[PDB]
Amino acid sequence: SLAGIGLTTTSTFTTAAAAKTMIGTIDTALQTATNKLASLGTSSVGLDTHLTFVG
């Protein structure tokens, strides 16, 4: 959620400089969200491997 990716429910820009900072803010948000999704996928593969061993 936007609270978890460093953004806010009311985050916005009102000027060109605010947008110029918003570029880097969105960059960091996309980076951290993509890292979280990668960790979730690694956890899913680990659950599948444990499933095979349990069988």
Partner: protein, 54 residues
């Protein structure tokens, strides 16, 4: 006097042709702003072009 009147009309035409030099509400040649920066890369780094009043 005729040469003077034609000179006045020509300078008025210069001022008005310079007034009309806008592209979609923004101009670089009429002195309305000091400079316009343009995007150069995905990180937002600019490509400044100083305005040249005409």
């Amino acid at each position: 006097n005729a040469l003077k009147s034609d000179f006045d009309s020509l300078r008025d035409q210069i001022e008005k042709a310079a007034t009309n030099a806008k592209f979609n509400g923004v101009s670089i040649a009429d002195g309305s702003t000091t400079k316009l920066t343009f995007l150069a890369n995905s990180d937002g780094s600019g490509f400044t072009v100083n305005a040249k009043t005409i």
